[PDB]
Design an enzyme around this catalytic site. Structure first.
Site: not given
Ligand SMILES: CN1CCN(CCOc2cc(OC3CCOCC3)c3c(Nc4c(Cl)ccc5c4OCO5)ncnc3c2)CC1
Length: 293
Positions: A49, A53-54, A56, A72, A166, A171
């Site tokens: 997703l 740097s942090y 994935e 994450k 932030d 987010n």
């Molecule tokens: C192909 N696409 C189909 C739809 N799908 C939608 C869901 O997308 C996400 C994305 C997330 O993170 C990205 C969003 C922007 O920042 C970079 C990553 C999600 C997310 N991120 C997350 C963050 Cl920002 C911080 C801490 C975390 C996280 O997950 C577990 O711990 N968390 C939960 N759902 C997400 C759904 C996308 C692909």
């Protein structure tokens, strides 16, 4: 603090500042005598997703319940005790927030091999991704709901003396039929506890002006949300610096991008973008406006 302690220079373990019944991890598909990590053994990795740097963020299916989650994973083993404490703070902040319908829910967290894993619910796309897919300004009918839901999140944080620091399109995550959840709590601070000082800076595009002088308060989040909604509602790229950055922090709304706002939405954003944090509306005061009930 930790830097002058004898904690330097040193098997998955659960991470939680609310100790649950045992910090040893188990799952269908996981055998600790096999060399693969708990994360490799206990999840189907479906897609990445995000990355940076942090580390994935992965979309995964849990072998425990067969449900989808976001995990994450930090990039590299902890640099040392301060690095470790900084990263674990995200778990503590998630647990301080706790259960709220407009906040991302933490399922569990663990460390292994110096790597931190944060497993949350899988949300819909971020507002940033939703705007990218729309390719245009979002309709105000949608925006009002995103603003209200994220204000509900902030009111919850702020009532506990927490500042997110932030808030941004990337987010705030969509959901069922247009509801939003605030996530990404890695920079969140508890006022009076951090004694900081050592507080990291959020994305400069959305940073409240008073943070340049070190004036940290809940009002900072209201400003960041103001510009988040401005960007989303006007399809407007925000400057990282320069004259445009200064103008947005002087009560200025560029006519080139903001003329299409309704007077109602513009008036709310002017309240949120007040340069003086002592005059800026609170999350609770905004939610009390008839337009936001
Ligand atoms: C192909 N696409 C189909 C739809 N799908 C939608 C869901 O997308 C996400 C994305 C997330 O993170 C990205 C969003 C922007 O920042 C970079 C990553 C999600 C997310 N991120 C997350 C963050 Cl920002 C911080 C801490 C975390 C996280 O997950 C577990 O711990 N968390 C939960 N759902 C997400 C759904 C996308 C692909």
């Amino acid at each position: 603090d930790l830097g002058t302690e004898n904690l330097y220079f040193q098997q998955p373990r659960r991470v939680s500042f609310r100790g649950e019944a045992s910090e040893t991890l188990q799952s269908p598909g996981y055998d600790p005598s096999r060399p693969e990590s708990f994360f490799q053994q206990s999840f189907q990795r479906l897609s990445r997703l995000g990355h940076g740097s942090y580390g994935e963020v992965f979309k995964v299916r849990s072998k425990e319940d067969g449900r989808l989650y976001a995990v994450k994973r930090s990039m590299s083993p902890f640099r040392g005790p301060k690095d470790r404490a900084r990263k674990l703070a995200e778990v503590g902040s998630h647990e301080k927030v706790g259960q709220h319908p407009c906040c991302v829910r933490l399922e569990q967290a663990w460390e292994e091999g110096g790597i931190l894993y944060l497993q949350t619910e899988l949300c819909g796309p971020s507002l940033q991704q939703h705007c990218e897919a729309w390719g245009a300004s979002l309709p105000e009918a949608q925006v009002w709901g995103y603003l209200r839901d994220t204000l509900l999140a902030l009111a919850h944080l702020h009532s506990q003396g927490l500042v997110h620091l932030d808030v941004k399109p990337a987010n705030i995550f969509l959901g069922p039929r247009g509801r939003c959840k605030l996530g990404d709590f890695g920079l969140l601070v508890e006022l009076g506890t951090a004694g900081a000082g050592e507080v990291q800076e959020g994305d400069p595009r959305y940073m409240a002006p008073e943070l340049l002088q070190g004036s940290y308060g809940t009002a900072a989040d209201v400003f960041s949300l103001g510009l988040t909604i401005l960007e989303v509602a006007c399809n407007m790229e925000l400057p990282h610096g320069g004259e445009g950055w200064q103008q947005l922090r002087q009560g200025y709304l560029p006519p080139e991008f903001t003329a299409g706002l309704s007077s109602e939405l513009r008036s709310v954003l002017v309240m949120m973008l007040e340069p003086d944090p002592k005059l800026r509306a609170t999350a609770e005061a905004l939610l009390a406006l008839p337009v936001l009930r």
